[PDB]
């Protein structure tokens, strides 16, 4: 019954109220392995395909919500494959005048991503190394590829996120808006906890790994929080392997803009990736992120199989895929490059996105009427 991104969103938005959304997507591309291969490994992923999804929700001619998600599909062979959803950034600007559930909106967008057939990303992949021939300008006289793969539809699915509080993620200076509710680190952890817990109950099989760690904290308080979860199998810790010595570098996934990756790079700069085990990693991560602006960070991981086989190829109503990386960045930058100290930023972002889509792509933002009763 729920099929399109329109169906999903509509279902969590309030009865009879008008919204619009942007669903933007980069062109899938070959990338480095999510986790640094080691020389003892039997598998090197023959290929890792990365795709960014960027979402914005609008009400009454103003942007008010945005969400940045990456989907990696890792290929080992014809027969085995893994998908990973990395939730990078979510944000609010406080420029919405009706009551909505921002967590049910985030949950349901994630539920849309989970329903996508991983083969959708594999049909046309921009290669990591591209062949090229250049014509030197001497030849003009005065008289004058994409890769494709397949995997099974039902594959191991993982979700990784890292909670850390900030004034803003996607809306510069939105903290200057007095209507903006800025979550502290504890609220933020519990807000993402609720979402993933619902995702488990609604979309995952009962044999799914669900993990939480609050780095640099003793695991005693984590276990307390988790007792209030409705999915029965939450455990303290993470979904990461323990290859090599439990060296962190061979186990830690390297995501865009992510604190785990930023510290891995820091360690690389000191020649210490052969010396920092996982247990130390979390300790030393804590101390630098903490001592920078002391604050609760959490790391959450899901790993298991969907209750329903993903088989959707998003239509043009579900996603807009710009022809270029520059066009992708230009559209996104109308949202992220704007100032949100006044409601005018939320208006200009709407105005600019709408005009760009109409003039350069003859496409409108999608409109929805909410269906959820009070």
Model description:
This protein has 374 residues and is α+β, with helices and mostly antiparallel strands. The protein has one domain. The protein contains 9 helices and 10 strands. Strands 1, 2, 3, 4, 5, 6, 7, 8, 9 and 10 form a 10-stranded mixed sheet that branches. It is globular, with a radius of gyration of 22 Å.
Layout: helices, strands, pairs:
Layout: H1 5-12, E1 18-25, E2 29-30, E3 47-59, E4 62-75, E5 81-92, H2 102-115, H3 119-122, E6 156-163, H4 185-203, E7 209-213, H5 219-226, E8 234-236, H6 259-268, H7 278-293, E9 298-304, H8 325-336, H9 343-361, E10 366-369
Parallel strand pairs: 5-6, 7-8
Antiparallel strand pairs: 1-3, 1-10, 2-3, 3-4, 4-5, 6-9, 7-9
Query: Structural class, please?
Result: alpha+beta
Major β-sheet annotation: 10 strands, mixed
Order of helices and strands: HEEEEEHHEHEHEHHEHHE
Terminal-residue CA separation = 21 Å
Helix percentage: 25-40%
Shape: globular
Counting structural domains, the number is: 1
Query: Number of helix segments?
Result: 9
If you compute it from the alpha carbons, what radius of gyration comes out, rounded to the nearest whole angstrom?
22 Å
The fraction of residues assigned to DSSP E strands is 15-25%
Please provide the count of β strands.
Answer: 10
GO cellular component, one term: chromatin
Binding site for acetyl-CoA: 90-92, 99-103, 162, 166, 181-183, 191
Catalytic activity: L-lysyl-[histone] + acetyl-CoA = N(6)-acetyl-L-lysyl-[histone] + CoA + H(+); L-lysyl-[protein] + acetyl-CoA = N(6)-acetyl-L-lysyl-[protein] + CoA + H(+)
Family: Belongs to the RTT109 family.
